[PDB]
Structure 1
Amino acid sequence: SMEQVAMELRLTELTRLLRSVLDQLQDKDPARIFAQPVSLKEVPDYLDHIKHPMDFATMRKRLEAQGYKNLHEFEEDFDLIIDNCMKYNARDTVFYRAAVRLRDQGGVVLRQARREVDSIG
């Protein structure tokens, strides 16, 4: 059906819009703390602490596979990155501090991006 192609033309363009957004959110992590998944060889207890791990490269895998059906799904992953970090790491730490900085600066990019989804459909 041509009605599936029109949906795909919309999901293609969401992926194209979220691709841009992800870049801006990851330009807010120049220390690249959140780039890669937390190592299981280097933090073997990790999954005892954190049950849904998340990182930018993982979010990018899903993204290029057209695995985000809407913006809300994409925001959920972003918050997993931040919130996982802020429970796993204590408050006087470089890792926690980076999560907070990324949350504060992400709120501006996401506030615009919610409008470009609503506006452009």
Structure 2
Amino acid sequence: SMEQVAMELRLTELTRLLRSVLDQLQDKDPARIFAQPVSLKEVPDYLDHIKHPMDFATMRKRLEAQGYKNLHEFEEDFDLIIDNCMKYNARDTVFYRAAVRLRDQGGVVLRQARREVDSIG
């Protein structure tokens, strides 16, 4: 049907926009702290602590499968990256502080993405 096609085109354009968002967030992480999953072979107890691990490579995989149906879903995954880091790592660490800074800088990017998604429909 043409209605199905129109929904598919909308999902694709949302995907395009979420890609540009993902690239922008990732530019705020030049150290690449959040680029890849935590290795269960190097924080071996990680999964006793953190129930839903997340990272930018994992988000990129989901995005390439057009796996985010709306901005809220994408935001939830970004908030997991930040929130997991702030739980596992202490306040005094480089990791916790990098999560705080990414949250702050990512706020700006997400704030405009919400306006663009609303505006474009």
* TM-score scaled by length of structure 2: 0.99
State how far apart, in whole Å, the 1-side matches of 2:115 and 2:13 are.
15
For residue 24 of structure 1, report the CA deviation from its aligned partner: 0.3
For residue 44 of structure 1, report the CA deviation from its aligned partner: 1.2
- Residue in structure 2 matched with residue 20 of structure 1 by the alignment: 20
State how far apart, in whole Å, the 1-side matches of 2:31 and 2:21 are.
18
For residues 67-87 of structure 1, give each alpha carbon's deviation from its aligned partner in whole angstroms, at most 9, with x where no partner exists: 000000000000000000000
- Residue in structure 1 matched with residue 49 of structure 2 by the alignment: 49
State the 4+ residue runs in structure 1 displaced beyond 3 angstroms: none
Please give the residue correspondences for 1:64-75 in structure 2 after superposition, counting only pairs within 5 Å.
Answer: 64-75=64-75
For residue 92 of structure 1, report the CA deviation from its aligned partner: 0.4
For residues 33-64 of structure 1, give each alpha carbon's deviation from its aligned partner in whole angstroms, at most 9, with x where no partner exists: 00000000111110100000000000000000
Which stretches in structure 1 are left out of the alignment for 5+ residues? none
State how far apart, in whole Å, the 1-side matches of 2:83 and 2:29 are.
15
Number of residues of Structure 1 aligned to a counterpart in Structure 2: 121
State how far apart, in whole Å, the 2-side matches of 1:62 and 1:53 are.
14
- Residue in structure 1 matched with residue 89 of structure 2 by the alignment: 89
- Residue in structure 2 matched with residue 31 of structure 1 by the alignment: 31
State how far apart, in whole Å, the 2-side matches of 1:54 and 1:116 are.
25
State how far apart, in whole Å, the 2-side matches of 1:19 and 1:77 are.
14
For residue 2 of structure 1, report the CA deviation from its aligned partner: 1.0
CA RMSD of aligned residues (A): 0.4
Q: Percent identity?
A: 100
